[PDB]
Design an enzyme around this catalytic site. Structure first.
Site, mmCIF file in Angstrom:
data_model
loop_
_atom_site.group_PDB
_atom_site.id
_atom_site.type_symbol
_atom_site.label_atom_id
_atom_site.label_comp_id
_atom_site.label_asym_id
_atom_site.label_seq_id
_atom_site.Cartn_x
_atom_site.Cartn_y
_atom_site.Cartn_z
ATOM 1 N N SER A 73 0.872 -1.199 0.000
ATOM 2 C CA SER A 73 0.000 0.000 0.000
ATOM 3 C C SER A 73 0.890 1.225 0.000
ATOM 4 C CB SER A 73 -1.061 -0.097 1.064
ATOM 5 O OG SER A 73 -2.051 0.873 0.768
ATOM 6 N N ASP A 90 -9.835 -3.984 -4.846
ATOM 7 C CA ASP A 90 -9.217 -3.005 -3.920
ATOM 8 C C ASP A 90 -9.999 -1.686 -3.974
ATOM 9 O OD1 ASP A 90 -7.522 -1.304 -2.447
ATOM 10 O OD2 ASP A 90 -5.758 -2.428 -3.183
ATOM 11 N N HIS A 103 -7.838 -5.128 -0.655
ATOM 12 C CA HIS A 103 -6.582 -4.386 -0.392
ATOM 13 C C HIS A 103 -5.670 -5.170 0.562
ATOM 14 C CE1 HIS A 103 -4.045 -0.951 -0.326
ATOM 15 N NE2 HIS A 103 -4.078 -0.892 1.022
#
Length: 259
Positions: free
Chosen positions: A130, A176, A208
């Site tokens: 991320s 996501d 995610h």
């Protein structure tokens, strides 16, 4: 011959297992010794050989525990791996890039002899989840000497990675909603030069947080990627190329890579 090859000729079974062939030990990088990042855990093969070194950053609000399964699994295939905590959980992707750079410096210069003697300091990679995947892209843009970069469901507001020359595997998550592939992973992959070794793997049915959950696919392709690029290990090409094109939504690459 390739001096950097480690372990047996790979199979799908070897790559999909919970652990690779190398038993792993851990060393703490404490917040006291860690200059420029929040500390972390060094996973290293017990077998006395030299290996590539990898630094892995978590995302926003994340700690090393969110990527630990993957650092340990990668190390177990013959890598020295540090999973970091950042200075603060709120650090931005470009700050995570400096922390990844600090963690590589830490493992090479500041870890114990058990760790420093097992690192080939010319063979480095970075990975991240991320915002840590954004930091992966930033550091790769700044460090053409890095052998591999693996952004995992990466998040970055910079969409142009045309300066990156490091072999880069982006893992996206089709569903996501935090770092949507349409606005993060896909534009990142598209903007990487056509002329580098790169791949985009979009997980099917994946949120995610897929990178935070032990995942045979992420493990298999992360390892294959690092083996191919960190170890120059062309035994692994056939896992990457043409690639998984059921649980992979999409896979694109610049296969076959130049050797």
């Amino acid at each position: 011959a390739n001096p950097y090859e480690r372990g047996p000729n790979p199979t799908d079974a070897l790559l999909e297992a919970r652990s690779g062939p190398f038993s792993v030990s851990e060393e703490r990088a404490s917040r006291f010794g860690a200059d420029g990042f929040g500390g972390g855990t060094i996973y290293y093969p017990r077998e006395n050989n030299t290996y590539g070194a990898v630094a892995i950053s978590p995302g926003y609000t994340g700690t090393q525990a969110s990527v630990a399964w993957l650092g340990e699994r990668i190390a177990s295939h013959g890598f020295v791996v540090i999973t970091i905590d950042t200075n603060t959980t709120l650090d931005q992707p470009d700050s995570r890039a400096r922390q990844l750079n600090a963690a590589l410096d830490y493992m090479i210069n500041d870890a114990s002899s058990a760790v420093r003697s097992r690192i080939d300091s010319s063979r480095l990679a970075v990975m991240g989840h991320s915002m840590g995947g954004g930091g992966t892209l930033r550091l790769a843009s700044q460090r053409p000497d890095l052998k591999a970069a693996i952004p995992l469901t990466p998040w970055h507001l910079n969409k142009n990675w045309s300066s990156v020359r490091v072999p880069t595997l982006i893992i996206g998550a089709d569903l996501d909603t935090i770092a949507p592939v349409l606005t993060h992973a896909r534009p990142f992959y598209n903007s990487l030069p056509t002329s580098i070794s790169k791949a985009y793997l979009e997980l099917d049915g994946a949120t995610h947080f897929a990178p935070n959950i032990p995942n045979k696919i992420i493990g298999k392709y992360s390892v294959a990627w690092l083996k191919r690029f960190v170890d120059n290990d062309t035994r692994y090409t056939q896992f990457l190329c043409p690639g998984p094109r059921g649980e992979v939504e999409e896979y694109r690459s610049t296969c076959p890579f130049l050797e």
